[PDB]
């Protein structure tokens, strides 16, 4: 996360830290979002290089990546579902969404606490406008040109950018379609970054913090005319419901 501030997971209690097992402690790989006690949504691109549930561990309730966190919950991936139409195209990802059914070694799903909460899926449509300032959070880089990653959780505020704006040639042109969600800072000073992918785009809709997008791609981080691009979750509601319901 570029800009914003460091924060504890109580401000992002749905945030899921997704790691890969090593042959040797696991390596942090992607963010994710708890959308029901047993299910985590994230980006399919996080799993392509090794698409086996066995090789991943999910932690809820973490403010500091790769160390123990009070109130942590460690989960195995019982089921790994990647979108059937996932695709890469040399610039960007498409259909970039994954589901992870999580379970501890003792069989449990997430137990709600101050640090572990589900986040609401978006409504089918809603009448009544909401604000287009949405939160982003994760463990990604603090600048596109940083080597090294911050280790503690950050969060920030970006604003949704219309598809029509995001498809301008100065922006991403024809690479943006109706399934994507762009978000940027009007002054280009805060953005998601490398290592934030899979994490949530939280908008406030009908009073609910709401998972509106999943970090998918973006040219650099906080670059002018280059929004962060997000999987438009609302588009996949019936995909999601038909797998987790």
């Amino acid at each position: 996360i570029v800009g914003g501030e460091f924060t504890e997971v109580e401000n992002q209690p749905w945030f899921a830290a997704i790691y890969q097992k090593n042959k040797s402690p696991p390596s942090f790989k992607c963010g994710g979002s708890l959308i029901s006690p047993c299910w985590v949504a994230s980006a399919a691109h996080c799993f392509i290089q090794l698409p086996k549930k066995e090789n991943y561990v999910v932690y809820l309730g973490q403010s500091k990546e790769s160390s123990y966190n009070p109130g942590e919950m460690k989960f195995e991936v019982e089921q790994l579902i990647l979108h059937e139409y996932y695709r890469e195209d040399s610039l960007a990802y498409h259909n970039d969404i994954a589901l992870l059914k999580i379970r501890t070694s003792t069989g449990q799903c997430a137990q709600p606490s101050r640090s572990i909460q589900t986040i609401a899926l978006p409504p089918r449509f809603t009448d009544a406008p909401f604000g287009s300032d949405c939160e982003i959070t994760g463990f990604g880089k603090e600048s596109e040109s940083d080597y090294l990653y911050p280790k503690n959780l950050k969060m920030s505020v970006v604003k949704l950018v219309s598809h029509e704006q995001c498809m301008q040639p100065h922006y991403y042109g024809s690479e943006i379609n109706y399934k994507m969600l762009c978000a940027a800072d009007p002054e280009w000073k805060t953005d998601s970054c490398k290592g934030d992918s899979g994490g949530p785009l939280i908008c406030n809709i009908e009073g609910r913090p709401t998972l509106s997008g999943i970090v998918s791609w973006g040219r650099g981080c906080a670059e002018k005319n280059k929004p962060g691009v997000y999987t438009r979750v609302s588009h996949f509601l019936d995909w999601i419901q038909s797998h987790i319901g």
Binding site: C30, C46, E88, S90, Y149, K194, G195, W217
Partner: peptide, 10 residues
């Protein structure tokens, strides 16, 4: 890896 990935492994 597509050119605009934000993935830790890209």
């Amino acid at each position: 890896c597509p050119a605009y990935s934000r993935y830790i492994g890209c």
